[PDB]
Each structure stands twice: as C-alpha cells, then as structure tokens.
Amino acid sequence: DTIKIGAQSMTESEIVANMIAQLIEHDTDLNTALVKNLGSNYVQHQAMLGGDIDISATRYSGTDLTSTLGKEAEKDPKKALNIVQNEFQKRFSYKWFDSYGFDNTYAFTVTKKFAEKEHINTVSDLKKNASQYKLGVDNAWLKRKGDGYKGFVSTYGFEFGTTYPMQIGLVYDAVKNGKMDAVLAYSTDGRIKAYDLKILKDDKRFFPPYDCSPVIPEKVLKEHPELEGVINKLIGQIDTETMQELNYEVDGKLKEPSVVAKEFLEKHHYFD
C-alpha cells in the first residue's frame, strides 16, 4: 500500500510530487514514496511501464504528444490535450488528468538590456544577428523530434551561432550574467520575473502547448478507489502565476520542495 510518485528533475516536478504525497497521506492511510531524478518524460514513461512509479506528478501535453505518441506537434491547447488523453487511455489505459491549471512551455528568454540593444521583441527578431548569438538550452532539446531544435530550424529558418546544452536550472544565471545572449527557459520558472528577464513572443507558433497534468494508470486507480478524489483536489487549482511563486520558493529562496508543498497545502486547508 505504498504509492510511488515520480518526479522529473525539475524543481516543479519535485514540489508537485511532494504535494501529491502529502495530500495522499492526509486524506488516506496509503503511504507514499518519491522516485526522484527521472531525466525526462521518456524516463518517466518507461518507469510507469515497468511499474517503478504509480504516478507521474507532472507531464506536459506537447512533450508526450511529439515523443511518446509520435504525433505531429498540435498547436491548439484543447485539441492537443484531448489527443494525449484519448491516446493514453486507448494505448496504455493510463489516465492523463485535466491540467493543474498551468502551461510550462519552452520560452526564448533574454535580458531587457539585450533586447533594447538588439531591438528584440519576438523570436524572429533574433534572426538578423543569430549567428552572433550564444544560446543556452537544456540537456534534452537539441535532440528532441517535432518540438526540438531540428524543427525550430525548419520553422524559424535560422540557427544560432553556438548552442550550449546545460542543466535547465543554470540557464537563468547564465542569461542574467551575460554568459549567454539567449536561453530556452521554462515559462513557470520564477527566476524569469525575479531577474526581470524578457520572454520573446513565439511569433510563428512553433511550440505546441505544454499544459501540465498528473498521469496514473487506471489499474492503479481501480485498486485504490479513494485516490482519484485526492488528485482531483489539485485539478484546475494551480495557475502559472502560482507555480512561478512555488518554484521560486525552491530555486531562489532555497527551501525544500517538501516545505514549499506543505505550506501551499496548509494555505488551502488541504482543499478540505
């Protein structure tokens, strides 16, 4: 009776995974374990297949759509969501829930200085001097299909001078400190606001939506009928603006994801 909760290696996945674990134990007698440092959605998916985790705390619609399901990058939020839901159900009997209420999308990000200096408002504005720029990206974007670099190139019609892959958590100082001209940040990271960075408009709508949801096998839900009510408490409850604050509590204020989770659940009375 130990529910195994997967967290991807993002602050966000850790906060949400602890929130799920605590809400489970508060409402139930099921205990819980966290399985951290899953490198990606593929790692998260494989582990669910093998039964190493019972719950993905965080999955993102555009990410599994273009990799796990091998589909085209659907550009509409609603349609892209319905497609992963019906496909996860049809293919695996896994329930991809409705969103928590937030989108966590790749976002081209620069300092306000650099954008005045280079006159940048949109991702197409980068084209003009692109080969002069250094771009910071995560370990996994350059090789991704459909929504990765290969696809960025054939949509936007240019490449950056040099691309630097690094742990996502480092792209926020690297851009503030002039070490990169641009980075491919994640929009729910709270350091974008905290460092007064600028998100460039994705003017060609290259990126799919990345609405965030928990995923749990039906097999696991039927086995523990009191689980879905728990998870249901969180659905539609965390907007982007809230998830940016929560993330910042860990990345900026250096609090444990467990403490951030506890404090959020306490503020909302554990949603009863």
Cα 183 vs. chain centroid, distance in angstroms? Answer: 16
- Using the CB atoms, write b or e for 28-52: b if 16+ within 10 Å: beeebebbeebebbebbbebbeeee
With contact defined as beta carbons under 8 Å apart, do 103 and 109 qualify?
Answer: no
- Residue 86 token pair: 């019906």
Q: How far is CA 70 from CA 47, 67, 83, 146, 165, in A?
A: 19, 5, 12, 9, 24
How far is the C-alpha of 16 from the C-alpha of 9, rounded, in Å?
12
Q: How far is CA 210 from CA 61, 64, 107, 243, in A?
A: 5, 9, 11, 14
| Secondary structure of residue 25 in the 3-state scheme | helix
Method: X-ray
- Residue 139 token pair: 């370990």
**1-104+210-272: CATH homologous superfamily?**
Periplasmic binding protein-like II (3.40.190.10)
Q: What angle do CA 81, 86, 88 make, to 5 degrees?
A: 95
- Residue 25 token pair: 């134990």
- Residue 211 token pair: 């609405």
Q: What angle do CA 154, 124, 174 make, to 5 degrees?
A: 95
The residues, any chain, with a CB within 8 Å of residue 86's CB and separated by 6 or more, are: none
Q: Any long-range contacts for 250-253 (C-beta under 8 Å, 24+ apart)? A: 250/11, 250/14, 250/15, 251/11, 251/169, 251/172, 251/189, 251/190, 251/191, 252/190, 252/191, 252/194
Query: For residue 3, what is the enclosing H or E element?
Result: strand 2-8
Greatest CA separation found in the chain? Answer: 59
105-209 placed in CATH 3.40.190.120:
yes
How far is the C-alpha of 125 from the C-alpha of 128, rounded, in Å?
6
With contact defined as beta carbons under 8 Å apart, do 62 and 213 qualify?
Answer: no
According to CATH, where is 3.40.190.120 located in the chain? Answer: 105-209
- Residue 241 token pair: 């603006």
Supply the DSSP symbol for 123: G
- Residue 60 token pair: 């993102």
* Half-sphere exposure at residue 175, Cβ-oriented, CA atoms within 13 angstroms: 31
Counted residue by residue, the chain has a size of 272
- Using the CB atoms, write b or e for 75-96: b if 16+ within 10 Å: eebeebbebbbebbeeebebbb
- Residue 72 token pair: 């085209």
Query: For residue 217, what is the enclosing H or E element?
Result: strand 212-217
Q: What angle do CA 209, 95, 235 make, to 5 degrees?
A: 65
How far is the C-alpha of 215 from the C-alpha of 6, rounded, in Å?
10
How far is the C-alpha of 179 from the C-alpha of 54, rounded, in Å?
40
Positive or negative torsion for Cα 37, 153, 133, 244: negative
How far is the C-alpha of 172 from the C-alpha of 10, rounded, in Å?
14
Quick one: resolution in A? 2.4
According to CATH, where is 3.40.190.10 located in the chain? Answer: 1-104+210-272
Positive or negative torsion for Cα 46, 167, 190, 74: negative
* Half-sphere exposure at residue 151, Cβ-oriented, CA atoms within 13 angstroms: 15
51 backbone φψ class: left, alpha, beta (φ>0; ψ -120 to 50): left
Supply the DSSP symbol for 190: T
For 234, phi then psi, to 5°, come to -90, -10
